[PDB]
C-alpha cells in the first residue's frame, strides 16, 4: 500500500555475477541495519565462478557494496591414511544468505567434494557447505554437515543408505531466534532431501582451518526414508520456522518438498526433533508446491500462519484449457492443539508463465493497521513480463483477496525482479518496515521504503 | 609404520622457566600431530590436535608449532603442574604411532645418597633364603649405579632393584637394591657390599658387613 | 537406486 | 562432558581370553571413532585399534592383528576390546581414545585398565625386619616384603603414626611373586628406644602381619 | 405491436427494434401511417415494393469442396472440412444457422518420431526393438501408405550432480566404476530424420548404446520440447499425423528441477539443436514446464504418446491429464509390446473429433448440437468420441448476434483439433438502409437546411 514506489535506491554488482540471488538484512552490534546480498557466480582468484557475499551499507543513493571475504582456495588434508578435497569451483557461494544477529550465514550449496584412498573414492559430489561471519570482529567459520569418509564402495553394499553425498547443504537456509541454525539440503539421502541444525556458537567454537573433517555434537540431522512417497522429493528446498505447537519453548520447523509423492508437492511442518505434526499436500503435480514458505501472523491472533507457494500451477480456464500462473496458500493456525484445516484464501496468478508464489516475504505491518501483511513475487509477471511484485494486506479473516499495491519491474527483461525478497524491517529508521528486492539477472538490488500512508 | 622420534627423553628444569620438546617423523605429516599430557599416577590428557589448536580447557602458555616433519611443544612459564610426561602422536597414517616420551623433572642442588645396608632376618634365614637389602636415599641427579660384591667380588645374579619418582618436597630421588641368595649359598661367605656411584663422588660410597661377626 |  | 569410564583392573592367566570395556558418558558412543591404546613403561605407547561404533567397521596395527579384537555396543553405550590368547607381553595398561573434533584426532582418554597375565595363585607376603649392624647421628630402619601376589599392598609405620621421613619402594615382579621394600630415618635418640613396628596389608590374602624391629 | 409501439426515429432505429421489423422510405405515404411494421402490413397500406427496407438473415455457402475419400497421393489437396467457407449475414439481435461436417480420412500420412530412453536403466530395452522399424511399418501399412521415421534418444543433462564427474576415467565411462562399458552422457542428441526408409532405423538402432547417470528421474522433456520445436531438424510434414512417441521406465524431470545443478535459466522454448545433433542448451537451461511443453505440442500440432512401463504408468496418466491430447501406453518392461501400442494410440487419437473456435467477435455466440455415431443428434456439444478413421460426423450451429458492432466486416474460424482444413465463417452485419447511401444533407425539406432528409424522415443532421 505505502510502499514508495518513485524514489527506489539501487545497490549492483559485477556483471555476471547474480548479484542479488539472496538477500537478507543485517544489524551489527549498534543496530545499524545494512543489506547482505549474495551474487553465486562472482568471479574468485583464478577467474572462476566461485560466488561471493556483500555487505551493503544503507545509502539512500545505494551504490557499489563491498566484498564480504571469504577464503576461495581448493584444499586438501592427508590424514588417516586418506586424502580429503575441496572443491569450490561454481560451488556458487551467496546462494542464499541469511542474518542473525552480528552474523552472516552465506552458503555455497555446490561445493564439491572428495575423499581419496588408495585407488578407491568416496566419489566428487555436491555436499555444500555454509561459511559464517561476524563482520565487525572478522571471525570466520563453516560449516559442512554432510562431508563424510565413507568410500564408494561401502555405500554399494548397504544400498545407498544415509547417502549423504549429494546433500547441497545450504540451498536453503534459515536461523532460529534462539541461534540454531538451520540448513535444508534438498539431495541429502539420495534426493529424499534431509534437514541439519546446530547452534551457531558450536559451529564457531568447534570450527579450525584445514581440519575439513570435524565433529559438531550439538548438531542434529534429519532421518532417511525407506518410503518412495519421498522419492525425489527434494526435502529442503525451502525452509522456514514458526509456532505451531503452543509450546513456546520449543521451536517447529516448516520444510519444503516440491516434488514430494511423484511430483504432487507437499510441505511439512516438524518440531526440533523432525517427528512431523502436520503435511500440506499439494492441488497439482508439477505446481512445485513448496518451492517458497513463509511464517508470519496475519490475522492478528498471535497464532502463526503458513503461506505457500506453488509457482507453476496451472488454473483452469474455458474450454478445458490450462494457463501456468502460480499460485499462493494461506493456510490460519487454528486455536489450540488443531490441526491446519484446507487452506484459508486461495492466490492465483494471472501473467502466464508469470510464476506467481516464488517467493513469498513478510512485511511486518506495512500500513500499521494493526495486520501483518506480506508480499508476492512473479518474477515473470506483470503485463511486460519483466517482474511484479504484489502486496497483500491483512486482516482478521486472513488476507485481502486483492493487492493493495504493485512493485512493476525497474530493470529490464529477464532481471528475474522478485527471484527473492526480505521485509518486516525499517532499514531508513523512519517508523515503517521497508521491502529490498533482488533481480540477479539484472545483477542488481532495489530498496522501497515504506512513507506514511497517504488515504 | 611411521616412526616419531621425540627429544630429549628427559629434562631437569625449575618453574617460571621457558621448555620445548621436539618431535621428528620418518616423513612429512603436515601438521597432522598432536601433544598429550600423562600426570604422575594418572590417566592422559589432550593439550593440542592439528599441530597448533589447543584443546578446550587447555592454558593458554601451551602451544604447539612445526611443520613438514619436525613439531614442537613450548610451554612458557612452567607451573608445579607441568612436571610430568608427554608424549606426541601422529594420525597421518595408519597406524597411529606414539613418541619415546618426554618427563619433565624437577631441578636443584646435587646431593649425595645415604646407603644403608642391611642383613638377612632371623625369621628369613630360618625359611631357607637369605635377602641383603641397600637402600640408597635422598640424592640427586637421578643417575646413579650400584654394585653388589662377596668376599670383594662382584656378583650380579639375583639382584632386584627399585628406584622411586621424584620426591615431592625436596626433589630428591631413591633406590632399593635386594640380592637374594639361599640360606647355603649365603653361608658360603663372610663379606657382603653394595657400592655406590653418583656424579657427587668420583670414589664410590660403599657400606659393608661380616656375616658371623657383629 | 538411482538409474537402474 | 565427556568421560569415558573403562572397565576395573583384570587379573587373568596366561592363555585365557579378556575382554574390557569403555561405557561413555555425557554423549553417545556412536558420535565418534573409538580408539584403543596399549601402554608399558619400557615399550612406551602402542596404537591397537580403531572402530566405528556407527556402523562396526574397524582397523587395526598388523601387530595386534588376530590378538585383539575391538566391538561396540550402541545400546549399551560402550565400546569393547578383546584379547585372545594371552601372554607375558599382553600385561600392559589399555586406554580407549577418541577425538575431540578433528575426525582423526586423540584428544579424550579414559581413565585406563591394568591387565596382568600371570599363573601366580594368591600367596600371603612374608614380611621380615631389617635392623642396622652393630653408631652416627640418625639410624636407618627398613621392612622387607617378599612373595606375594597380587598387587597391591599398603605398608605403613607404626600403623600409620609414622609418616613422614619414609620412603616406600615400588613392588617388582619376582618370577611371578611381587617384592617391596620400604625404609624410615630418624635420629639416634628414637631408636630403640621408642618401639617401631612396621604395618603391611595384602587385602587378597586378607592377612595384616606386623613386625616390630629389633636389634642385633 | 413492436415496431410501432417502439416509436423510432429512423430506418436505422426500426431495424434494431427485431429481425421481424421493416420500414417504408415512400414519399406518398397516408397521414398517420407508422413507417415501421410488419413488412405484411406495410404492402397493406399502398407502400411501394421498392421503398421497403426489410434485410433477412442468410447463409450461403462459398466454398463448399467434396471430403476426400483417400488421403492418400495428392500434392496435400485434401478435404476433411466441408464447407471450407461460407458467407454469413445477420441483422441486430437476429440469428442465422448453418452445419459443417468432418471426416477423419482413411490413408493419411503419419509421422512417428521415437524418442528413447537410454539411461543405463534402459539396459534390457534397447534388444527387444532391434527390429523395430520393419516389425512396426508391416503392421502400420494397414492404416497407411505412406509412413515416416525418426529416431532421437535422451539421458540426462550431463552435469553434476546428475553424472558421475569422478574419477577422469568416469567422464569417458560412466560405467568405469563396474565391469563394463558404456557412452559417455549427454541430455539429448538426434539420431535419424523423419524418413520412409525403414531399414535406416533399424541400422541407426542397432549402433545405439545407453548411458549411466545417478538419479533415477531423466531429462526426458527436455527432448520432448527440442523434438517439438526443430521442426527442419526432426522432419515433420505439414500434412501428415504427428506422433512423438516417449518411451521411459523411470520418473521424469520438470522445471525447477534443474536449480540442483546450478541452472535456474527458465526453458525459453527455442530450437537449440546444431549440426552436432546434441541438445546444446542441456547444461544451461532447466526443465520445461508442462505448460510450455503444452504451448509448443498444440503449436506443432504434435500428438504426444507415453509409452512407460507398467511402474510409472499411474505417473505419467496423470501427466496426460494436463497435456490434453496426449495418450499413454503399457510399455511390457522389455518394450516387446510397443508395436502394438502405437496402433492401439493412433487409433485412440484419430478417435475423437472435437472443434475450435478462433477469432469470435464479442457479439457474436455460438451453439452446437452434435451428430455423432448413426445420426445420433446431441445437443450442446461440440465434440465426438468413439469414432473410426473413415467415419464422418457433422454439427448444427447457430450465430445469435447481440446488438449491431461497430464494425461490419468480420471473419472467424471453426476448426477440429489436430485437423489441417478449417471453415471459415465471413460475417456480414447488415443494420443499415439502401436509402441511407443517398440522403440529403441541409434538405430544404427539414427545418430549412438545419436537418437531413433521408428514408422519408428528417434528421437532426451532424452537431445538434
Ligand atoms: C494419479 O492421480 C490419481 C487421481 O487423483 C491419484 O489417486 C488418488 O490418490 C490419492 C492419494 O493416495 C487418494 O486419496 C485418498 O483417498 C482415499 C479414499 O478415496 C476413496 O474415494 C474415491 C472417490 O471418492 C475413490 O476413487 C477411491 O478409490 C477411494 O475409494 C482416502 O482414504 C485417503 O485419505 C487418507 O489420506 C489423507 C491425506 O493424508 C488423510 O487426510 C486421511 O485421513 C487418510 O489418512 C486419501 O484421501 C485418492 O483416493 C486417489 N484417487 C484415485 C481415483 O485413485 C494417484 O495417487 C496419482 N498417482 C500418481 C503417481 O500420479
Ligand atoms: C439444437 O437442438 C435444440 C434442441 O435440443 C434446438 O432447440 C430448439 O429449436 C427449435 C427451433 O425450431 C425451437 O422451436 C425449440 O423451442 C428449441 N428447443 C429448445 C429446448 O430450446 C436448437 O434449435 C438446435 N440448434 C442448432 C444450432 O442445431
Ligand atoms: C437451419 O435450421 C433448419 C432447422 O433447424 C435447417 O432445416 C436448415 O438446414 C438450417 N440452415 C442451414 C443453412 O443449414
Ligand atoms: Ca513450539
Ligand atoms: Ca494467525
Ligand atoms: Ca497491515
Ligand atoms: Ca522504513
Ligand atoms: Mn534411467
Ligand atoms: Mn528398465
Ligand atoms: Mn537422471
Given at each position: ?39 553465486p ?8 565462478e566461485t560466488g ?22 581448493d ?10 578435497q575441496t572443491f569450490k569451483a561454481r560451488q556458487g557461494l551467496?546462494a542464499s ?10 552458503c555455497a550449496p555446490w561445493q564439491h567434494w572428495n575423499v ?6 568416496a566419489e566428487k559430489t555436491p555436499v555444500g557447505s555454509c ?13 559442512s554437515p554432510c562431508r563424510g ?14 547417502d549423504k553425498r549429494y546433500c547441497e547443504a545450504g540451498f536453503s ?10 540448513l535444508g539440503a534438498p539431495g541429502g539421502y539420495y534426493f529424499?532431501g534431509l534437514?541439519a ?37 527434494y526435502?529442503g ?219 | ?214 | 537406486?538411482?538409474?537402474? | ?216 | ?156 543433462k550431463?552435469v553434476s550432480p546428475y553424472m558421475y564427474i569422478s ?46 547417470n545417478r538419479d ?41 528441477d534443474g536449480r540442483l545443478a546450478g541452472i ?19 547444461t ?181
Open positions: 500500500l505505502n510502499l514508495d514506489p518513485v524514489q527506489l535506491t539501487f545497490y549492483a554488482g559485477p556483471n555476471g555475477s547474480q548479484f542479488g540471488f539472496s538477500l537478507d538484512f543485517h544489524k551489527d552490534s549498534h543496530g545499524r541495519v545494512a543489506i547482505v546480498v549474495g551474487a557466480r562472482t568471479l574468485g582468484p583464478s577467474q572462476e561471493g557475499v556483500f555487505l551493503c551499507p544503507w545509502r539512500a543513493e545505494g551504490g557499489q557494496c563491498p566484498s564480504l571475504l571469504f577464503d576461495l582456495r584444499e586438501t588434508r592427508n590424514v588417516g591414511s586418506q586424502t580429503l551467496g544468505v541469511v542474518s542473525w544477529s552480528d552474523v552472516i550465514v552465506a581419496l584412498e588408495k585407488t578407491e573414492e561459511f559464517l561471519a561476524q563482520p565487525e570482529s572478522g571471525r570466520r567459520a563453516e560449516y569418509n565413507t568410500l564408494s564402495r561401502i555405500y554399494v553394499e548397504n544400498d545407498f543408505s544415509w537456509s534459515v536461523v532460529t531466534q534462539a541461534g540454531e541454525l538451520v529424499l534437514l541444525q546446530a547452534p551457531v556458537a558450536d559451529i564457531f567454537s568447534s570450527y579450525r582451518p584445514g581440519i575439513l573433517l570435524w565433529h559438531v555434537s550439538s548438531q542434529s540431522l534429519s532421518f532417511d526414508s525407506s518410503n518412495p512417497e519421498y522419492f525425489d522429493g526435502w528446498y525451502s525452509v522456514a520456522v514458526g509456532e505451531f505447537d503452543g509450546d513456546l519453548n520449543t521451536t517447529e520447523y516448516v520444510v519444503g518438498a516440491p516434488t514430494w509423492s511423484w511430483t504432487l508437492g507437499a510441505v511439512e511442518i516438524l518440531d526440533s526433533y523432525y517427528q512431523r505434526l502436520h503435511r500440506l499436500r499439494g492441488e497439482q503435480m508439477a505446481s512445485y508446491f513448496g518451492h517458497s514458505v513463509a511464517v508470519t501472523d496475519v490475522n492478528g491472533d498471535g497464532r502463526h500462519d503458513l503461506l505457500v507457494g506453488a509457482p507453476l500451477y496451472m488454473e483452469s480456464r474455458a474450454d478445458r484449457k490450462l494457463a501456468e500462473v502460480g499460485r499462493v496458500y494461506l493456510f490460519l493456525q487454528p486455536r489450540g492443539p488443531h490441526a491446519l484445516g484446507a487452506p484459508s484464501l486461495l492466490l492465483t496468478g494471472t501473467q502466464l508463465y508469470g510464476r506467481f508464489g516464488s517467493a513469498i516475504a513478510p512485511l511486518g505491518d506495512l500500513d500499521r493497521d494493526g495486520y501483518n501483511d506480506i508480499a508476492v513475487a512473479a518474477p515473470y509477471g506483470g503485463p511486460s513480463g519483466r517482474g511484479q511484485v504484489l502486496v497483500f494486506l491483512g486482516q482478521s479473516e486472513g488476507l485481502r483477496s486483492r493487492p493493495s499495491q504493485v512493485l512493476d519491474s525497474p530493470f529490464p527483461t529477464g532481471s528475474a525482479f522478485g527471484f527473492s525478497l526480505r521485509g518486516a524491517v525499517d532499514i531508513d529508521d523512519n517508523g515503517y518496515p521497508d521491502l529490498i528486492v533482488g533481480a540477479y539477472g539484472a545483477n542488481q538490488v532495489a530498496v522501497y521504503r515504506a512513507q506514511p500512508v497517504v488515504k | 609404520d611411521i616412526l616419531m622420534t621425540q627429544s630429549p627423553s628427559s629434562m631437569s628444569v625449575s618453574l617460571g622457566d621457558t621448555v620445548s620438546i621436539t618431535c621428528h617423523a620418518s616423513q612429512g605429516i603436515s601438521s597432522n600431530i598432536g601433544w598429550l599430557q600423562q600426570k604422575p599416577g594418572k590417566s592422559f590428557m589432550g593439550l593440542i590436535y592439528y599441530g597448533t589448536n589447543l584443546v578446550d580447557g587447555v592454558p593458554s602458555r601451551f602451544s604447539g608449532s612445526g611443520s613438514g616433519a619436525d613439531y614442537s611443544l613450548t610451554i612458557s612459564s612452567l607451573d608445579s603442574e607441568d612436571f610430568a610426561d608427554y608424549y606426541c602422536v601422529q594420525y597421518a597414517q595408519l597406524p597411529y604411532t606414539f613418541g619415546g616420551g618426554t618427563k619433565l623433572e624437577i631441578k636443584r642442588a646435587d646431593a649425595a645418597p645415604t646407603v644403608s645396608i642391611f642383613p638377612p632376618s632371623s625369621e628369613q634365614l630360618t625359611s631357607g633364603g637369605a635377602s641383603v637389602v641397600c637402600f640408597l636415599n635422598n640424592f640427586y641427579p637421578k643417575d646413579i649405579n650400584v654394585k653388589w660384591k662377596i668376599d670383594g667380588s662382584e656378583r650380579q645374579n639375583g639382584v632386584l632393584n627399585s628406584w622411586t619418582d621424584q620426591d615431592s618436597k625436596d626433589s630428591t630421588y631413591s633406590m632399593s637394591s635386594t640380592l637374594t641368595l639361599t640360606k647355603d649359598e649365603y653361608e658360603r661367605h663372610n663379606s657382603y657390599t653394595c657400592e655406590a656411584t653418583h656424579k657427587t663422588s668420583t670414589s664410590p660410597i660403599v657400606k659393608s658387613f661380616n656375616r658371623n661377626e657383629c | 537406486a538411482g538409474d537402474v | 562432558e565427556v568421560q569415558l569410564q573403562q572397565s576395573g583392573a583384570e587379573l587373568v592367566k596366561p592363555g585365557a581370553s579378556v575382554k574390557l570395556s569403555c561405557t561413555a558418558s555425557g554423549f553417545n558412543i556412536k558420535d565418534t571413532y573409538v580408539h584403543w591404546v596399549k601402554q608399558r613403561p619400557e615399550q612406551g605407547l602402542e596404537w591397537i585399534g580403531r572402530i566405528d561404533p556407527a556402523n562396526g567397521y574397524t582397523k587395526y596395527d598388523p601387530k595386534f592383528q588376530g590378538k585383539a579384537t575391538i566391538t561396540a555396543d550402541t545400546s549399551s553405550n560402550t565400546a569393547y576390546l578383546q584379547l585372545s590368547s594371552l601372554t607375558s607381553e599382553d600385561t600392559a595398561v589399555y586406554y580407549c581414545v577418541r577425538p575431540l573434533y578433528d575426525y582423526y584426532a586423540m584428544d579424550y582418554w579414559g581413565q585406563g585398565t591394568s591387565v596382568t597375565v600371570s599363573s601366580a595363585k594368591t600367596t600371603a607376603p612374608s614380611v621380615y625386619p631389617l635392623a642396622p649392624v652393630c653408631t652416627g647421628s640418625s639410624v636407618t630402619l627398613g621392612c622387607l616384603v617378599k612373595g606375594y601376589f597380587p598387587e597391591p599392598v599398603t605398608l605403613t609405620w607404626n600403623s600409620g603414626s609414622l609418616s613422614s621421613g619414609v620412603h616406600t619402594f615400588p613392588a617388582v615382579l619376582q618370577s611371578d611373586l611381587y617384592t617391596l621394600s620400604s625404609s624410615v630415618t630418624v635420629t639416634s635418640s628414637t631408636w630403640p628406644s621408642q618401639s617401631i613396628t612396621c604395618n603391611v596389608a595384602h587385602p587378597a590374602s586378607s592377612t595384616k602381619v606386623d613386625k616390630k624391629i629389633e636389634p642385633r | 405491436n413492436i415496431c410501432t409501439t417502439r416509436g423510432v426515429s429512423s430506418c436505422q432505429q426500426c431495424l434494431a427494434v427485431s429481425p421481424m421489423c421493416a420500414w417504408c422510405s415512400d414519399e406518398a405515404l397516408p397521414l398517420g401511417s407508422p413507417r415501421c411494421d410488419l413488412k405484411e402490413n406495410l404492402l397493406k397500406d399502398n407502400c411501394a415494393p421498392e421503398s421497403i427496407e426489410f434485410p433477412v438473415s442468410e447463409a450461403r455457402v462459398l466454398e463448399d469442396r467434396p471430403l476426400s475419400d483417400k488421403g492418400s497421393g495428392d500434392s496435400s489437396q485434401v478435404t476433411q472440412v466441408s464447407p471450407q467457407r461460407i458467407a454469413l449475414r445477420l441483422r441486430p439481435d437476429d440469428s442465422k444457422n448453418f452445419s459443417i461436417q468432418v471426416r477423419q480420412v482413411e490413408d493419411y500420412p503419419v509421422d512417428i518420431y521415437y524418442l528413447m530412453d537410454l539411461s543405463y536403466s534402459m539396459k534390457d530395452d534397447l534388444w527387444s526393438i532391434q527390429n523395430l522399424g520393419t516389425k512396426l511399418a508391416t503392421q502400420m501399412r494397414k492404416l497407411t501408405s505412406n509412413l515416416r521415421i525418426g529416431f532421437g534418444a535422451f539421458v540426462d550431463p574419477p577422469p576415467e568416469a567422464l569417458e565411462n560412466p560405467c568405469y566404476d563396474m565391469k563394463t562399458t558404456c557412452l559417455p552422457m549427454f541430455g539429448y542428441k538426434h539420431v535419424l530424420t523423419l524418413t520412409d526408409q525403414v531399414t535406416r532405423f533399424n541400422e541407426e538402432v542397432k549402433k545405439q548404446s545407453v548411458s549411466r533415477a528421474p531423466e531429462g526426458g522433456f527436455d527432448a520432448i520440447m527440442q523434438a517439438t520445436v526443430c521442426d527442419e531438424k526432426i522432419g515433420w510434414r505439414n500434412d501428415a499425423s504427428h506422433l512423438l512417441v516417449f518411451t521411459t521406465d523411470a520418473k521424469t524431470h520438470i522445471a525447477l535456474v535459466q527458465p526453458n525459453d522454448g527455442q530450437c537449440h539443436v546444431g549440426s552436432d545433433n546434441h541438445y546444446s542448451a542441456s544451461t537451461m532447466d526443465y520445461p514446464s508442462l505448460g510450455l511443453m503444452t504451448e509448443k505440442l498444440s503449436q506443432k500440432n504434435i500428438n504426444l504418446i507415453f509409452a512407460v512401463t507398467e511402474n510409472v504408468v499411474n505417473l505419467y496418466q496423470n501427466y496426460s491429464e494436463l497435456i490434453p491430447g496426449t495418450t499413454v501406453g503399457v510399455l511390457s518392461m522389455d518394450s516387446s509390446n510397443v508395436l502394438q501400442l502405437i496402433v492401439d494410440a493412433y487409433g485412440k487419437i484419430r478417435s475423437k473429433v472435437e472443434l475450435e473456435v478462433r477469432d469470435l467477435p464479442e457479439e457474436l455466440s455460438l451453439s452446437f448440437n452434435a451428430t455423432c455415431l448413426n445420426n445420433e443428434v446431441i445437443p450442446g456439444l461440440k465434440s465426438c468420441m468413439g469414432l473410426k478413421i473413415g467415419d464422418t460426423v457433422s454439427f448444427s450451429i447457430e450465430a445469435k448476434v447481440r446488438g449491431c458492432p461497430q464494425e461490419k466486416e468480420k471473419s472467424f474460424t471453426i476448426k477440429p483439433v489436430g485437423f489441417k482444413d478449417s471453415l471459415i465463417v465471413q460475417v456480414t452485419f447488415d443494420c443499415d438502409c439502401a436509402c441511407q447511401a443517398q440522403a440529403e444533407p441541409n434538405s430544404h425539406r427539414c427545418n430549412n437546411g438545419n436537418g437531413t432528409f433521408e428514408c422519408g424522415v428528417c434528421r437532426c443532421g451532424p452537431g445538434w
